[PDB]
Design a binder for this molecule. Sequence first.
Ligand SMILES: O=c1ccn([C@@H]2O[C@H](CO[P@](=O)(S)OP(=O)(O)OP(=O)(O)O)[C@@H](O)[C@H]2O)c(=O)[nH]1
Ligand SMILES: [Mg+2]
Lengths: 340, 913
Amino acid sequence: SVPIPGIKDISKLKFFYGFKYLWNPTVYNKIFDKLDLTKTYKHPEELKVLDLYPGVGIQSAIFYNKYCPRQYSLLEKRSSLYKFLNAKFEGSPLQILKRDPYDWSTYSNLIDEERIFVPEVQSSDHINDKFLTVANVTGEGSEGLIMQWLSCIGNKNWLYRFGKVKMLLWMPSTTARKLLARPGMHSRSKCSVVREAFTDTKLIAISDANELKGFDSQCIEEWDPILFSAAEIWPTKGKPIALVEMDPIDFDFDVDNWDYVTRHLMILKRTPLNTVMDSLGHGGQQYFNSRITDKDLLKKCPIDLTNDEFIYLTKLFMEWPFKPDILMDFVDMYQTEHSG
Amino acid sequence: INFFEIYNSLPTLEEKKAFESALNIFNQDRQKVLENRATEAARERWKHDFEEAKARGDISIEKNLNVKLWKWYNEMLPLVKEEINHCRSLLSEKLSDKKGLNKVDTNRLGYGPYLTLIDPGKMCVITILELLKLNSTGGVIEGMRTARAVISVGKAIEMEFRSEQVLKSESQAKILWPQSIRARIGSVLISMLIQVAKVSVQGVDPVTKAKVHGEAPAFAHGYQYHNGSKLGVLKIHKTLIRQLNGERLIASVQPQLLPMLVEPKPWVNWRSGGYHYTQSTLLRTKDSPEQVAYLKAASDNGDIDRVYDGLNVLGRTPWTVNRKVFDVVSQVWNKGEGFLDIPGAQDEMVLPPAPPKNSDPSILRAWKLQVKTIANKFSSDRSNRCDTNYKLEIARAFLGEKLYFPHNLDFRGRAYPLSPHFNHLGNDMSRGLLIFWHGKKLGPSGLKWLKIHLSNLFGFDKLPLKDRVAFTESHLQDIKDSAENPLTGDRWWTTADKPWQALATCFELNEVMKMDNPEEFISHQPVHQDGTCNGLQHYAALGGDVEGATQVNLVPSDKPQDVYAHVARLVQKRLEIAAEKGDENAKILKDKITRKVVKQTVMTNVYGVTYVGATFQIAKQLSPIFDDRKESLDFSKYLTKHVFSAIRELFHSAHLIQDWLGESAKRISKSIRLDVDEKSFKNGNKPDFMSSVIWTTPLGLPIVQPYREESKKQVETNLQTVFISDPFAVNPVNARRQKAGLPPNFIHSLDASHMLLSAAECGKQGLDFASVHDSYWTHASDIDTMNVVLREQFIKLHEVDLVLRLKEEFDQRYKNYVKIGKLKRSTDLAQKIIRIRKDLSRKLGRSTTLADEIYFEKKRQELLNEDITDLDALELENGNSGMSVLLPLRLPEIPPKGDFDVTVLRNSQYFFS
DNA sequence: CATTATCTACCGACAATATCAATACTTAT
DNA sequence: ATAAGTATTGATATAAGTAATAGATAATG
Ligand SMILES: O=c1ccn([C@@H]2O[C@H](CO[P@](=O)(S)OP(=O)(O)OP(=O)(O)O)[C@@H](O)[C@H]2O)c(=O)[nH]1
Ligand SMILES: [Mg+2]
């Protein structure tokens, strides 16, 4: 019987470092019914959940009261929030750890060295049934962390060495609009192509009525996202938030060449492919004209391209005899001194 | 041919003067042709090489490189002449309404008038030369930044145009192109070159592993992401980079501003001096109208004449390339192995085994960082080898001829040559090559001083003069061995701190040892009076410290005391006890701390160095000896903490003067002028701050700190939209940089002033004098006279208290300012209250001061639409309640100047040695 | 009065762009 | 009597270990 903290307690915490959480139990019950987590993790009495950036710890209490997993690790390294978690969930079967989840080392130490949290690695054909990760990365400055966590899916390195672990991610509405843009929308950028290539992600709930104007209309109809007012998050200053369920999928491209090609095409994301393939090295336009056979594709500006066209273009790039060096794609900011 | 050897062969000085006059006139004509015909001569040289290569065969070699240059030029001239043709066909406008909305509307009608003014072949050759010269600059791996390239080419074409105009004006008997037009012109020309340049390349196809050869564009326009902020780049094919690390690069890309063979145009006005046709301003004013405006006012008033005297003495000193050292460096370069600094031939970098993807993210990040480190090291070595190649080619050009360097000043007043590539103020190799053209007999003092210089080079500048002479005497065998065969020997000169100058002086000493009477020998090698903590010397003199002056060799002593060594020892003792205590950080570093490591932190520390800077400075200094991670800064963090702890106690007068300067800079930066502005800018209640720190050099030169908040904007070009800043936009001052920069600029101004005074005096005595900011060079004979002059001029500079004169000058220049006042803390004087009112009548005459000031109060958002309103509002504050007040700027009170006769340095021989 | 976004001593030096949301402005119908 | 570009401008995203680093610290609400 985990005691859930309400608005009274979480009104007392003065510092939040910029993170906005949710406190209404009714919308959380609605969300956990919409997600229907009891379909994949059919035996929760064996599931182990790793909660990053839990903060106030209401989602955690409701999750535990509804599913009773075996191990629930809240990684919150912040003074007032850690104090809150140890004064409210003391002795409770929740596992409260004072560890920064931002640094990569935390996961290596926890799973590898100390073996406090040891989940079970499974194949890469079905979405993992014994490991669920939930995260609240809602700071307006801490958005690059989400990009790192998405990139880890491509390398299969950080927590995705246990297969396809499903993530329940709270994120700023601007990040959710970037990640969930469909080809040709205004907010389509390389973050969206990464999301499309590695993941299929659905909008489980949003914190605003006038935000649905940034997502694709057919996709907004397909997802059927839960809505709530801006009076539901407790620190009511920052922009609205959006919860996104993110499960990795299969992929068979070369992630390094795909990164290069996508990053250098999505710089000039509105010049037609007649003239944007020259930024990919020396002599790119002549070669990519001699190789690309479908001259309808040459008129799609690289914002119009789906991910399959990017995989095709990276296939042509890796077939290029005179392709440039992909590894020296940086600026020597460190010590290009230029003495003479 | 070789002028220097025959000139030295002459027995009598009058014959030398006749020889010098004849060479001077013939070199007048030679220099005159050199400036104008540099591009024509270079273009003729490579077209000739292309024709010569054609007969032999077509292989990818240096002659092929010249062939490529003549091919790019040959296939770029028609494009640019078609552009010019459409420019003249469209410059006859009819109606500016129905025009090509992109290609002519902003593009062609805008730069139209500027393309007609200069003939096309000049523009093509200039674009090729100026794009090759920018190879691997601005942070790009093997290319350039697009902004730097576009602006440099536009500026080179404009300056060549202005040279054409100067030549036409002397023969027959815009003013400053805006940044936007320069950008558009540069972008159009480099675009055409991008669209013509093609170089053959060889590649390996992936599926069949069968080599395939093809022609690809030599230049390419791309982008690169750093830190999220995209950057435009121009990449050059690696096949061309392989050929830029080649011996014949100087023929392709000619240096226009190289040391002139005639006497520099002696400085008579800020607008003229040194170079004949390329105008050179007396100030390297980076991006300021105010700096040039104040310099112009000074020059018109003419009160800086001493700066002209110093620059004219600095410039009229003749050098000559050392033939023997050139031979040794050429042998070492041709050998191909990595020498002391010449890194050595390298084909392509090798990276460690790539880590598997499934590895922890930190491991991949660490590998990526290592890849960045390896790439940086490779590009650094490649750049060093290329720079050395350029320097050796210029040295080869002048193997016999004597050369003069025209000096210029940065905005403080330190003298920097005008020739950027090759000058005596570069790294050690450049200094080794150069020797004084005029040779003077050593004499009794001269021989000993030459020996003391050789001891100085070997790192034994710490010990007294007698010990230096003893050290030189003890190693006579090493001197003869090193002199006889530079290589294939003991190579004693190599161990020295300064590797090349040491061999050159070894050659001089070997010649001296072969003479029965050393004094009759005539020497060329300049002796360096280096200065021990010169900034500290100036702080001690200004403050008037006695203990501080004693530490810094000001007061006469038998043994030289250098502050760096003393603090380094103190830090060493404390670190040793710390390592014994039990920390592991100190044990590794307990011994390595030496004078060199501490000196950088101590100098910067007096000057207001933020802790991050100290951490990096120490990391770089201690990286070679390999006592901690050269890449990492974590190990170095503690060391700087202790350095600061030991240092803080040491300094009192320097800290007082630096603090006063910082407080004065902050108050002056945050001040608002009454007179110029009678209108509120209406940006807000608080106007902008456009007043900058300004003081005058003791010589009379004006110094104006150009630390503004620059406003860049994206101007559109043919290639991209470049983020450049327009120099004419005056903007508010960056208070942070003013406060952090006043102390170093003041001390550097004083240092440069002392140099210019001593240079004028030495040139008056007839001694050639060359000075690298804080070390003065002269023949080993006249070194004694120079030693006397240095001290004397220091006296003539510090006889008057300079900080007080500076504060008085500040109070004069900034009396009628009104610093914005926040909520009150206390009161200082009793004229603040009269400032707000300005109701005292000003009848029958000037003293308008109240009239101009009262209207400014109306701009302080008064409580009115009236007259007695705001005055009543402020009565409460003095009587209590804080307001954002308008108080008169009041500069602080200068620190108490301790009693110490500066005139006691006249008898200290370790002051400069 | 409580809380935060810049830099990291100074000089020779030498720099983010593409896109689009919207504006004042000239055209003109 | 009656509207659509449009040169200028300003905001926003960009990659993604807080630029190769992390403690002050001037400066808003
Ligand atoms: O990083 C620096 C280095 C040097 N300088 C300034 O350049 C001048 C001399 O620079 P250096 O001669 S080499 O270093 P010194 O402090 O003179 O040590 P030394 O006594 O020669 O063994 C001197 O005015 C110094 O303040 C800086 O301002 N910043
Ligand atoms: Mg010195």
